[PDB]
Amino acid sequence: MSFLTVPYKLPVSLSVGSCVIIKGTLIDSSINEPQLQVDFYTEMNEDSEIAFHLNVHLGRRVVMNSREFGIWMLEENLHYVPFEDGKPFDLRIYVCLNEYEVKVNGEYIYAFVHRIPPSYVKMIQVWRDVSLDSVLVNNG
Numbered sequence: 850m851s852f853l854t855v856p857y858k859l860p861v862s863l864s865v866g867s868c869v870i871i872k873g874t875l876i877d878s879s880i881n882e883p884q885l886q887v888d889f890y891t892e893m894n895e896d897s898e899i900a901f902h903l904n905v906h907l908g909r910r911v912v913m914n915s916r917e918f919g920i921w922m923l924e925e926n927l928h929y930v931p932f933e934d935g936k937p938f939d940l941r942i943y944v945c946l947n948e949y950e951v952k953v954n955g956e957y958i959y960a961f962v963h964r965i966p967p968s969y970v971k972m973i974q975v976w977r978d979v980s981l982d983s984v985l986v987n988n989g
């Protein structure tokens with residue numbers, strides 16, 4: 850099966866207990882730009898609110914934030930970067946009552962407290978130079 854074409858957009862509806870599962874491979878192929886970006890938008894429109902934004906800078910940091918009323922808010926930085934150049938990853942973003950639980954390759958790495966209710970998310974975009982196998986939302 851061919852990798853998904855990026856930028857990859859997916860209409861979604863998230864509730865507590867939903868899980869976004871993103872499988873792919875990152876490569877060290879960018880200059881001053883992240884190797885993976887994931888944005889959760891409140892409308893099917895790139896100017897809308899971003900409830901959750903994650904980007905990967907291989908060997909440096911995982912960055913998380915929101916974009917509310919056009920403004921990037923408090924940046925949350927991790928220096929634990931489980932993603933590796935050319936190796937497959939399994940990224941899970943689980944919607945809890947108070948936070949997203951961010952999980953990579955079976956490790957719990959961060960709890961991002963909700964800033965916009967996740968019930969307002971309508972579209973996920975996964976982009977940058979990722980070789981993307983699948984993006985799906987499970988309800989349960």
Ligand SMILES: OC[C@H]1O[C@@H](O[C@H]2[C@H](O)[C@@H](O)[C@H](O)O[C@@H]2CO)[C@H](O)[C@@H](O)[C@H]1O
Pocket residue numbers: 902904912913914921922924
């Ligand atoms: O916070 C997410 C936001 O980051 C912007 O870049 C930041 C960068 O993370 C920070 O280290 C630097 O000091 O300031 C920059 C803001 O100009 C990205 O431009 C944006 O797309 C998001 O990734």
